[PDB]
Amino acid sequence: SIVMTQTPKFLLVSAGDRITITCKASQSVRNDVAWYQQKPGQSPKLLIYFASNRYTGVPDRFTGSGSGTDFTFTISTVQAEDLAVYFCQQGYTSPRTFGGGTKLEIKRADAAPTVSIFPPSSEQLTSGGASVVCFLNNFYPKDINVKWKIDGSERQNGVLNSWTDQDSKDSTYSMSSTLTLTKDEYERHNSYTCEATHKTSTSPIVKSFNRNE
Amino acid sequence: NVNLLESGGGLVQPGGSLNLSCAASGFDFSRYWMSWARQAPGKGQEWIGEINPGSSTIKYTPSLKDKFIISRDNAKNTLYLQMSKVSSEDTALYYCARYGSYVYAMDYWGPGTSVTVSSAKTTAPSVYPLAPVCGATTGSSVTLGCLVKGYFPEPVTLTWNSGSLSSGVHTFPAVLQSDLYTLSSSVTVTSSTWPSQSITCNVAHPASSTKVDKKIEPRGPT
Ligand SMILES: *[C@@H]1O[C@H](CO[C@@H]2O[C@@H](C)[C@@H](O)[C@@H](O)[C@@H]2O)[C@@H](O[C@@H]2O[C@H](CO)[C@@H](O[C@@H]3O[C@H](CO)[C@@H](O)[C@H](O)[C@@H]3O)[C@H](O)[C@H]2NC(C)=O)[C@H](O)[C@H]1NC(C)=O
């Protein structure tokens, strides 16, 4: 069974850049290699077939080359909308195996997050559970640290973070930090704070509320 | 108007069986080779198998050749995947795809149908509206939240105002804990539109026949 080793696995590029992805086949696959593009939340689209041919309607940006075991895929001028996973496939013999994919990440300017803190919903506390939600929106780059503070003291247990994929429109990321307490624990304390340390500033972004307000 | 639409995905017991189907339209299905592929969470695409127009040639990736069966009914323009002996390694999004004429390349892919192999039980989400902090917000814009807690399995679909509110939305990926997922979604609108006009989050969890809407209003006695 033929292995398609695709490199690099991850790729950070700016709009305007030429990029070259490589697929190495563990044995000959003639010229019979296709390349696909899979944007977030969408199904793959065929860009290249028989290694060097653009599929119908694919823009001139995208090219491919190779034969035998060495194959490349090239975007001559990377555009923001090219944010996606690119993977190869050999179709010389069954099973028609895929490469592992290359995740393309778009370099844009640094942007601080817009932070919004949310008390437990009016509709949640009756259930006995209490979720405190902090949204950190439209920031770059991806890495960011969220510190929860209850009455001034830090809380690490019960926190869960979730990042969005890079937006195809503005190339930013968003993140939700959810602190899960019991109703009883939530009611013991008054001050609730989420702090967003991002490289865009030395000073953390602080959003806060008091339970009895 | 080439179109593929998968269905049949859902929750199945480990070791159990499940049948997927894929409806083809906008082309003469009987002229084309068809294939199935799948994408496990966080992993790459994996080719499952293919079948030629007359069903005389059916091929599988070896790991699957004794547990999955591919068939097609040209009279119905439908492609089928008979899954059996399933395990957690079979949890994935399953895609049907057409081979282009004269190439073993998948020139059109369906949107996919989600399959989860698990012993855990189907559980509907609680859905909670998240209004801003009690103080009346300054500033030109307002961020609202919708929290979707404690459902199984994936997925859930979340829209705002039945989808007529699409800009300024971020829907965060579900996180799994103790065989229960939690997801949230934020929407940012101008303060001229809220709270003077209504905003609702619409949550659908098909696996539990659940459809819950939550209108979001400012916190406080009513
Ligand atoms: C998944 O689908 C298989 C296959 O059935 C065929 O393919 C599907 C994709 C659809 O197009 C179906 O409409 C189509 O028939 C199902 O297998 C079928 O299961 C039934 C039992 O549920 C079998 O009937 C039995 O047949 C034996 C004879 O061997 C009798 O002794 C029994 O009393 C009973 O009549 C049927 O033969 C079988 N068909 C095939 C081709 O294997 C399967 O049930 C389905 N699975 C799920 C979970 O839906």
Numbering used by the authors:
A (entry chain B): 25 to 237
B (entry chain A): 15 to 236
Task: Share the article's original sentences.
The parasite inhibitory anti-PfCyRPA c12 mAb binds tightly to PfCyRPA with a Kd of ca. 1 nM as determined by surface plasmon resonance analysis. This mAb recognizes PfCyRPA independent of its glycosylation, as revealed by Western blot analyses. Because of these favorable properties, we chose c12 for epitope mapping by determining the structure of a PfCyRPA/c12 complex. In a first step, we determined the crystal structure of c12 in isolation. The four c12 molecules superimpose onto their variable VHVL di-domains with an average rmsd of 0.35 Å, which reveals a minor spread of the elbow angles between 133.1° and 135.8°. The high structural congruence indicates that the CDR conformations are genuine and not dominated by crystal contacts. Third, consistent with the similar conformations of the CDR loops in the individual c12 Fab structures there are negligible conformational changes in the c12 CDR loops when bound to PfCyRPA.
Sequencing and annotation of the P. falciparum genome has supported the identification of new blood-stage vaccine candidate antigens, among which the P. falciparum Cysteine-Rich Protective Antigen (PfCyRPA) has a number of noteworthy properties. Moreover, PfCyRPA-specific monoclonal antibodies (mAb) inhibit parasite growth both in vitro and in vivo by blocking merozoite invasion.
